[PDB]
Scaffold this active site. Structure first.
Site, PDB file in Angstrom:
ATOM      1  N   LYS A 196    -168.858  27.136  53.004  1.00 40.24           N
ATOM      2  CA  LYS A 196    -168.140  27.159  54.277  1.00 40.24           C
ATOM      3  C   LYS A 196    -166.697  27.640  54.118  1.00 40.24           C
ATOM      4  O   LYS A 196    -165.954  27.713  55.082  1.00 40.24           O
ATOM      5  CB  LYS A 196    -168.213  25.794  54.971  1.00 40.24           C
ATOM      6  CG  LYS A 196    -169.550  25.593  55.674  1.00 40.24           C
ATOM      7  CD  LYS A 196    -169.670  24.247  56.350  1.00 40.24           C
ATOM      8  CE  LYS A 196    -170.632  24.342  57.520  1.00 40.24           C
ATOM      9  NZ  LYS A 196    -171.577  25.472  57.318  1.00 40.24           N
ATOM     10  N   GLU A 265    -165.135  22.800  63.274  1.00 39.85           N
ATOM     11  CA  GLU A 265    -166.041  22.228  62.318  1.00 39.85           C
ATOM     12  C   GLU A 265    -165.390  21.764  61.023  1.00 39.85           C
ATOM     13  O   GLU A 265    -166.088  21.367  60.082  1.00 39.85           O
ATOM     14  CB  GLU A 265    -167.191  23.204  62.062  1.00 39.85           C
ATOM     15  CG  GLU A 265    -168.075  23.326  63.318  1.00 39.85           C
ATOM     16  CD  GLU A 265    -169.352  24.124  63.115  1.00 39.85           C
ATOM     17  OE1 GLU A 265    -169.398  24.997  62.215  1.00 39.85           O
ATOM     18  OE2 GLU A 265    -170.312  23.877  63.875  1.00 39.85           O
TER      19      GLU A 265
END
Ligand SMILES: *[C@@H]1O[C@H](CO[C@@H]2O[C@@H](C)[C@@H](O)[C@@H](O)[C@@H]2O)[C@@H](O[C@@H]2O[C@H](CO)[C@@H](O)[C@H](O)[C@H]2NC(C)=O)[C@H](O)[C@H]1NC(C)=O
Ligand SMILES: O=c1ccn([C@@H]2O[C@H](COP(=O)(O)OP(=O)(O)O)[C@@H](O)[C@H]2O)c(=O)[nH]1
Ligand SMILES: *[C@@H]1O[C@H](CO)[C@@H](O)[C@H](O)[C@H]1NC(C)=O
Ligand code: NA
Length: 369
Positions: A196, A265
């Site tokens: 990520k 996120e």
């Protein structure tokens, strides 16, 4: 014609019956309410409230003494919004709706219509044009946070929602779970997985309504603690909202986060582990909270679905997948309801309105006890 009791117990025959009904020509041609219908219906607020059956009085004193704030970020599907709002509406709570600046004129007017009917529902005082995966999605929630924190001093917790969410607990059960939190926040917050990182190591820009990787290398985050990974969805105290709106270090983190991919996120997941943030946990990984262990939102990811007795965190989707996320069918509900989360995502009247109907009914029945 659909037995919602059988659906909620998970009766394969009743579920199959829904699946078959969904396939009919007659079902797909069913008459739908328009944003113009809502503009019309909301001219007469008294009749709208009565007709749509909103709850005009708090149900218990326990609930009255525990006000909740909601931030709801929407852009389309007025019928789903009205169903969601009706399901969560209480006179003692507060509701800020952020309508995407790019939404259709008629949708925005319909949202304003609905809001004008309630003293505690209103449109965010500043609207963002929300580009998928960009900062403006976070910015929408911050706008609502700002309005809500200013308008009332007494609400306990803020919960953020989107237009396609639905509660799986009653207001009363939510209030009790929040009382159980004891001034602590609750949201997913886990060690940053290495896959990520490309999302915030590089600068992203909006090119033609679309967020794109520029390839420019960002400075490290302005933070002593690590970045943590989580979700857009949170349950947080009013004191947390206050701190986040005014604290200078948090501000620098946010400004740094503006040109990242999907900042929603990691932003909340990360702030939740900074010492001195009200309701935060220590950054030790012993306190990490997965999406299943947090209560904020139940969501099924396609690549995780499977045999629960074999290691899958949850059973396969019965609706359809949209961008890897299950949009719930009626077959999903039984198992979903035994979970501890407050809300679930995603639902869709266009895909399976029977799921929403049964869930809607069950919750109203359960509450009125
Ligand atoms: C506002 O709505 C009323 C009621 O219309 C019904 O409910 C709406 C939400 C929508 O689903 C409509 O299709 C429904 O018919 C309208 O009054 C109706 O007007 C039509 C056309 O003249 C007539 O056939 C009906 O008998 C009327 N029904 C009632 C209850 O009076 C009204 O015209 C709408 N007003 C505006 C300004 O659009
Ligand atoms: O053009 C858009 C698309 C998305 N959204 C909002 O952004 C949030 C996340 O959208 P969605 O869940 O569809 O994104 P995804 O599920 O693909 O991550 C929701 O509140 C939407 O209402 C929006 O305001 N405008
Ligand atoms: C629906 O199913 C339940 C449980 O099997 C049954 O008890 C109930 O009578 C049914 N409802 C109706 C109205 O048919
Ligand atoms: Na209002």
């Amino acid at each position: 014609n659909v037995n919602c009791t059988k659906i909620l117990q998970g009766d394969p025959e009743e579920i199959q019956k829904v699946k078959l009904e969904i396939l009919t020509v007659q079902f797909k041609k069913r008459p739908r309410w328009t944003p113009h219908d809502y503009i019309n219906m909301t001219r007469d607020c008294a009749s709208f409230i009565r007709t749509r059956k909103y709850i005009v009085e708090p149900l218990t004193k326990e609930e009255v003494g525990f006000p909740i704030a909601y931030s709801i970020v929407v852009h389309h599907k007025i019928e789903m919004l009205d169903r969601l709002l009706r399901a969560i509406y209480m006179p003692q709570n507060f509701y800020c709706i952020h309508v995407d600046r790019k939404a259709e004129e008629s949708f925005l007017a319909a949202v304003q219509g609905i809001a004008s009917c309630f003293d505690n529902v209103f449109v965010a005082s500043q609207l963002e044009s929300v580009v998928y995966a960009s900062w403006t999605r976070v910015k929408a929630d911050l706008n609502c946070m700002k309005d809500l924190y200013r308008m009332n001093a007494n609400w306990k917790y803020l919960i953020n929602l989107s237009g396609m969410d639905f509660p799986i607990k009653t207001n009363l059960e939510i209030v009790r779970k929040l009382k159980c939190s004891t001034g602590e926040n609750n949201l997913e917050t886990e060690k940053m997985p290495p896959n990520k990182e490309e999302r915030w190591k590089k600068r992203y820009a909006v090119v033609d309504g679309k967020l794109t990787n520029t390839g420019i290398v960002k400075a490290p985050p302005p933070l002593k603690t690590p970045l943590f990974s989580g979700s857009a969805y949170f349950v947080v105290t009013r004191e947390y909202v206050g701190y986040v709106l005014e604290n200078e270090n948090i501000q620098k983190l946010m400004e740094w986060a503006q040109d990242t991919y999907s900042p929603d996120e990691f932003l909340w997941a990360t702030i939740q582990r900074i010492p001195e943030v009200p309701g935060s946990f220590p950054s030790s990984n012993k306190y990490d909270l997965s999406d299943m262990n947090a209560i904020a939102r139940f969501v099924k990811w396609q690549y995780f679905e499977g045999d629960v007795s074999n290691g899958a965190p949850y059973p396969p989707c019965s609706g359809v997948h949209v961008r890897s996320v299950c949009v719930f069918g009626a077959g999903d509900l039984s198992w979903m309801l035994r979970q501890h989360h407050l809300f679930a995502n995603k639902f869709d009247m266009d895909v399976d309105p029977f799921a929403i109907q049964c869930l809607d009914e069950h919750l109203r029945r359960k509450a009125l006890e």
